[PDB]
């Protein structure tokens, strides 16, 4: 019969999502004119120096560095954590689906606290891991008592967390972090939307913590999230097997060439990113001001809003699309009830402000 | 003790190959007193539209398409054979673990059939299943008895062969395949090499064989080894379980831009193809006048030769690296007494024969 190993035959259908493009097209204008919110990428792009490296690439016939250690190099420098703690991955997410593959056996327990990123579940279900929900709170806080329950009970082997969280954008605090720590589980912290808050990156935990990895990436800041480059800080007794799983060269020249471009430039991404910070607050204030909308507080680049007064979320969303606006709704049913609006430039803000007028 | 799973603690890792900035740093020569002949990359580099194209990428800050689709469009156009067969990976190389990953659970088996591609062993062991090897003939030709008379007896799910082989570059006998075909088990075909040879793709053959794969790539002819993307052609009833399954995103707008631009320059890849051929036949005759190398008929951009007269292949590759020219040497037991040299400019060949004449 299949040659596909069973647990795969139970995966959800694929979900075909309506490029840009092709709704630009649909509605008869350039790509560049959709204002697009529901993805969390930096309109402003990566620093200058970013296409003029891509645009004068050496050697794109020759396999790219396995150990990409010129980035890693850089990322020491800024990150005061050593190299050999660093690995370089396609995107962040390469680095999620390596630990997932090189902790979790079939049938092997992870800790999810929804709502938060899709990709854990989707990456524990195609490693035929078990996911355990425990739930955020109505504030999107992590339920810390509720979470060492679970872990001394069932024994699972590792637990994602996201800070800025995606969707909602809170931050876990130093004191439940250091709590879930104590647990003899596998914590991953993923600081993706780290650099849009004032909280500092915790890589340099790892060095006192052999249970904690810290995920980050160029992918939304950085404006890389084509390229695919993003990295993370593991403990040594970890990173030495990570290393010799891990597939050779998933890092192309160009992710490697431009991550180390935009870090030649660090007074462009902090200009970039205070203008998104600075565009959060202005857009919270629109957007609390709708009657149908409650937007939760973030630190990320984006602002989650709870869909009120009946109105559907999913037309919502539709409708801004026929107007050329892009925002974010689920089909997760622990989200189906909220809309996601990522930061862009003012222009855009006000662009989807009139057209929500409209509606 | 250890996160990590009981198999992977006694990997054995993957030896890679290292790109012209570490090899600088290694050797201290600049990378244009490199003559690097190790990786069976395209010394011509790509079509001109590539550059063009990656210096004019719009949108670098937003997520590359996850169905390729542009992409797959150019591949129906080239194959022959429908979008909807064809997958794109990051390389070949993420094609060749996404299957093993999406096939084999921890404990089922692969045939391998060596002298071979040295990643199929490296992603098995990954993915904790098991190898069974099934050595080529002395001609590097498959022992397809032995292959018939190995998949019965221990029911492997899965066998990866390459055509042309990695790394002697001989071509598989259709009439073996469709012998292969015939057995209960999943056949993938890497044709990694294939536009080297004067024999057509089997992509085709996929549409009525629902247990063959065939595998391609943008890294060696079409000279897009660093940007990590090739493609697949897959039945229908494995490939609609695989779009569920594969990363969304691991094929950057870089690699997928690349791809596009090269497939529009037909004559640049053929011309390129040609001058590597006709140097493949050159410097096959000059290593055979070699007194220690052996050369074997190649239809690739490679030529393996088994190393005699008392010299160490090991000691043969790193003398060579110290005048600046890098062959590629094996360490596993398989192809410990071979080097295999890739085809280069005829100037690389060049240096080569000019380093081999000091050699003591
Ligand atoms: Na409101
Ligand atoms: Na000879």
């Known amino acids: 019969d299949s040659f596909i190993r069973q647990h795969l035959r139970k995966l959800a259908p694929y979900q075909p999502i309506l490029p840009f493009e092709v709704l630009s097209s649909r509605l008869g204008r350039k790509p560049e004119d959709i204002v697009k919110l ?22 794109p016939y020759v396999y790219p560095d396995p150990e990409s250690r010129r980035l890693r190099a850089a990322l020491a420098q800024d990150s005061g954590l ?36 899709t990709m854990y579940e989707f990456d524990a279900a195609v490693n035929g891991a ?21 872990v001394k009970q069932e024994k699972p082997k590792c637990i994602f967390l996201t ?5 909602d954008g809170s931050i876990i605090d130093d004191d439940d972090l250091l709590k879930i720590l104590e647990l003899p589980i596998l914590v991953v912290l ?30 939304k800041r950085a404006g890389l999230a084509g ?15 990570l290393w010799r799983a891990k597939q050779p060269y998933n890092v192309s020249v160009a992710a490697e ?14 200009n970039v990113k205070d203008a998104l910070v600075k565009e959060r607050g202005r857009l919270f204030d629109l957007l609390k001001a709708v009657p149908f909308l409650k937007p939760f507080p973030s630190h990320s680049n984006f602002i989650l809003c709870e869909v009120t007064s009946g109105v559907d979320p999913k037309k919502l969303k539709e409708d801004l699309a026929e107007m050329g606006v892009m925002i974010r709704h689920y089909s997760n049913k622990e989200l189906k009830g909220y809309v996601r609006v990522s930061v862009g430039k003012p222009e855009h803000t006000d662009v989807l402000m009139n057209c929500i007028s409209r509606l």
């Open 38 to 59: 529901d993805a969390n990428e930096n309109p402003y792009g990566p620093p200058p120096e970013v296409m003029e490296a891509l645009g004068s690439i050496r050697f």
């Open 82 to 117: 050593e190299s050999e703690y660093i690995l370089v991955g396609c995107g962040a997410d390469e680095l999620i689906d390596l630990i997932m593959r090189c902790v979790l056996d079939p049938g092997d327990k992870i800790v999810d606290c929804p709502p938060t990123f």
């Open 130 to 150: 078990l996911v355990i929900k425990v739930p955020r709170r109505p504030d999107f806080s992590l339920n810390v008592e509720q979470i060492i329950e679970v």
């Open 163 to 167: 800070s800025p969280n995606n969707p």
């Open 190 to 219: 993923d600081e993706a939307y780290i650099e849009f808050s004032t909280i500092e990156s915790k890589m340099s935990w790892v060095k006192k913590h052999d249970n904690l990895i810290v995920l980050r990436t160029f992918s």
């Open 227 to 241: 390229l695919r480059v993003g990295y993370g800080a593991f403990p040594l007794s970890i990173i030495k097997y």
């Open 257 to 270: 060439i431009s991550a180390c471009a935009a870090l030649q430039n660090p007074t462009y991404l902090e």
